[PDB]
Design a protein around this ligand. Structure first.
Ligand code: HEM
Ligand code: HEM
Ligand SMILES: Cc1cc(N)nc(CCc2cc(CCN3CCN(C)CC3)cc(F)c2F)c1
Ligand SMILES: Cc1cc(N)nc(CCc2cc(CCN3CCN(C)CC3)cc(F)c2F)c1
Ligand SMILES: C[C@H](O)[C@H](O)[C@H]1CNc2nc(N)[nH]c(=O)c2N1
Ligand SMILES: C[C@H](O)[C@H](O)[C@H]1CNc2nc(N)[nH]c(=O)c2N1
Ligand SMILES: [Zn+2]
Lengths: 414, 411
């Protein structure tokens, strides 16, 4: 009812009341904590009986936000919604409700450290779309708008909500822009190893792969439960940064580059019990995502060795910290490169400090701020960023982004 | 909680099935609605006996003799002894088993592959602070072992009524001192200002430099605590130099060899050993990242990078990161040159994955706190970052307990 969190570096204490409005499973029980499990665990469409309570709850809070709680607008909306559910077994969100819900799902995303930006989100209503070609057009405009010549702008595009589960819209890509990965007969991997399965699907659908280290994957788009269709994103819309280093003249010879726009397209947006299974959203990068995870995870581009080599690092024993030494210079290269090309990026120190400031303001004005420590803390230099020493509470507020099965595991073909 | 619980390693796709969690008992603090995995810290007649019953069962189950020979008569004996003494006293074998399993069940501890190679010092005959000091001195000398450190625990008398607790008032057997300065700043270890002031209030004569070794403040049987100076020749210390930066030695940095936790409470069979200092050897990052680089500790980043002559204006130069790596290089290089036992976070984390695999195979699970197990530097390049971990409390265990000065009724 009045849960306290403490910062162990500053001794600031915060009081959380917002946790009382939480709902869905964390995955934890009184006896077991799952806060490091990645995701705790078709038919999934709700009844009329399940829907109105969820809908009423979301409408009640929308109206509470606009300072109209209990108004005649509020009461007619509740009636309009209840009646629409009763006669059509679902309901449609006003455009105002759609924008509020998108922004609040971002605000409520406990694993997201950049939520200080949550209310500055551009929302593209794509609920009038009916085909895969239409989807391709809607996504291109999103990419072009969000990219903005390097001055990135947060955005989400929202396609039609689920109905009976059998007519879903999906983006089969997990992100709008990612690089292919090709496994070789000899077990080696060309390109990004994370993407080998999906690259294989693309090729199976007719994609002619150029078979390179940095090939942009086609889009694979599903409208109204139909089979998905392929579309090349027009290359002039895919902004890319070549990775050089302020001090090492040789770093450019590593031939590394990355795309500027991170855009998640495999999650599911829940608003008032309604499920938007295709809602690609996009922000700008924290530098550690590229330089620590994409380049350095052993199951990703795995360049630590090569960088280490060119630094002439003693790689005999681990205790030389040759990996730690090499990772820092990679992450210096990535930030310096985006900055040099005026492509929006944020470093892990700036980003985490901003988050603490956000979290503190959310406690003051909203009464809480659910945060997943295991994801908020950056994957390098942890304890020298302020979030490490920050106690956080994790709970699920709705509206929310949620994981959903991979469409190729669920879709039934024709 | 369901028949299984599987956990996955994302870097390797290795999957492990947990069944041990069906034996946890106490609150994690989490509920189905909210999770507290990052919060630091979320008996009488009927109370005491069933905890003893479970442990003895656990013990006799642990030696292929469940329900067997002495087992029932040990259950009888414990039942009988509680009836007369209100509590009961652990056999030497039980004490060794419980202490080793307290380490085993320590979800926050990355070193637990070593758990069963623990040296147990039974100090349950102690009666005075002078005796506590002797028992501790012998622990420190054994555990230090001229640099080839060995893990040990010394267990003082169990609690009996709260009025007569045995307490080590230092949080570690060996810490440096912290002095407030006439101009608001701090000299020494800033985490230790309060304790340093208590010791001075108690008559400690401080030399007033950075790395002054704190005295021992021992409390036996609930009486007021007493100061003792550990004999310097027992306190192994390492001067931190760098294998590349000649100027690094000029930083004046040194640190001690023996991490030895003296403020926690060891729980076996419902009994409470409020004095039980235990010591291992260091993971390099504890010294280099946390002690040296936490802003509320020695806070040397600015110092190091300034002599590294790094661009310290904008954060995105990553000057803190660069200096941080160099510092922890110097710590490992310093301990290894002085042949003092130390482990880096790559070896340690890799060791913990083997242990996890071992525990799942032989025991059916291994409680781990991902938040504490992942090193505070270079997270995702160690193997524990990609390891799912379940966390749950098993007994016997080490627990936290209140600072004695917040609770002590002075004689
Ligand atoms: C504005 C700049 C943004 C920054 C700097 C940022 C930062 C991050 C980072 C570093 C992660 C962890 C990703 C990983 O390690 O895989 C993350 C996750 C996430 N972000 Fe943000 N983000 C931003 C924008 C957004 C927006 C616009 C939304 C939604 C409208 C959003 C929703 C999420 C969600 C749902 C996750 C969880 C991802 C998952 O569970 O797989 N973020 N964010
Ligand atoms: C032998 C080498 C050992 C290594 C390398 C090691 C490593 C570590 C590290 C790095 C931590 C985190 C400490 C912190 O960040 O404050 C920790 C915590 C802990 N270790 Fe170990 N450890 C070792 C031995 C032991 C022994 C012998 C015991 C008990 C008999 C033990 C019990 C614990 C406990 C209870 C914690 C929890 C700390 C807390 O709650 O504050 N460890 N260990
Ligand atoms: C909106 C937004 C802002 C921001 N800064 N970052 C993101 C994450 C995007 C992103 C994440 C990933 C990796 C995430 N996966 C890895 C596999 N694992 C099993 C599940 C999690 C790769 C991208 F190529 C990519 F683009 C989104
Ligand atoms: C057995 C063992 C082996 C090993 N390698 N390390 C340890 C950690 C001990 C240790 C920890 C600390 C600080 C840790 N505190 C900070 C405050 N926070 C609220 C709780 C944790 C300082 C020591 F001087 C010290 F020694 C124990
Ligand atoms: C608030 C947060 O839980 C706290 O700072 C934790 C984070 N993880 C940690 N992990 C270790 N090993 N040691 C610590 O002291 C901490 N501190
Ligand atoms: C098992 C573990 O939860 C997993 O590796 C998580 C840990 N924390 C993370 N944190 C971020 N920001 N991104 C991630 O992908 C992960 N992966
Ligand atoms: Zn939990």
């Amino acid at each position: 009812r009045f849960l306290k969190v403490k910062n162990w570096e500053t001794e600031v204490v915060l009081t959380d009341t917002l946790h009382l409005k939480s709902t869905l499973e964390t995955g934890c029980t009184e006896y077991i904590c799952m806060g490091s499990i990645m995701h705790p665990s078709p038919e999934d469409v709700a009844t009329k009986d399940q829907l109105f309570p969820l809908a009423k709850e979301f409408i009640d809070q929308y109206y509470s936000s606009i300072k109209r709680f209990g108004s005649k607008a509020h009461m007619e909306r509740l009636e309009e919604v209840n009646k629409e559910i009763d006669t059509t077994s679902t309901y449609q969100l006003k455009d105002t409700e759609l924008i509020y819900g998108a922004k609040h799902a971002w605000r409520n995303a406990s694993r997201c450290v950049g939520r200080i930006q949550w209310s500055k989100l551009q929302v593209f209503d794509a609920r009038d779309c009916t085909t895969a070609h239409g989807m391709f057009n809607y996504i291109c405009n999103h990419v072009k708008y969000a990219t903005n010549k390097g001055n990135l702008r947060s955005a989400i595009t929202i396609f039609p909500q689920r109905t009976d589960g059998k007519h879903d819209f999906r983006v089969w890509n997990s992100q709008l822009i990612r690089y292919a990965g090709y496994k070789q007969p000899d077990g080696s991997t060309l390109g990004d190893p994370a993407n080998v399965q999906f690259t294989e699907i693309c090729i199976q659908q007719g994609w002619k792969p150029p078979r390179g280290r940095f090939d942009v994957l086609p889009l694979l788009l599903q409208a109204n439960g139909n089979d998905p269709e392929l579309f090349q994103i027009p290359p002039e819309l895919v902004l890319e940064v070549p990775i050089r280093h302020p001090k090492f003249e040789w770093f450019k010879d590593l031939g590394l580059k990355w795309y500027g726009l991170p855009a998640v397209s495999n999650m599911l947006l829940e608003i008032g019990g309604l499920e938007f299974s295709a809602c690609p959203f996009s922000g700008w990068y924290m530098g550690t995502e590229i330089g620590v995870r994409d380049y350095c995870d052993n199951s990703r581009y795995n360049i630590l060795e090569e960088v280490a080599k060119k630094m002439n690092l003693d790689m005999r024993k681990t205790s030389s910290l040759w990996k730690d030494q090499a990772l820092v210079e990679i992450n210096i290269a990535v930030l310096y490169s985006f900055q040099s090309d005026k492509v929006t990026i944020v470093d892990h120190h700036s980003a985490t400090e901003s988050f603490i400031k956000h979290m503190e303001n959310e406690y003051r004005c909203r009464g809480g701020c659910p945060a997943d420590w295991v994801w908020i803390v950056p994957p390098m230099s942890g304890s020298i960023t302020p979030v490490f020493h920050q106690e956080m509470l994790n709970y699920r507020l709705t509206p929310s982004f949620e994981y959903q099965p991979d469409p190729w595991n669920t879709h039934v073909w024709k």
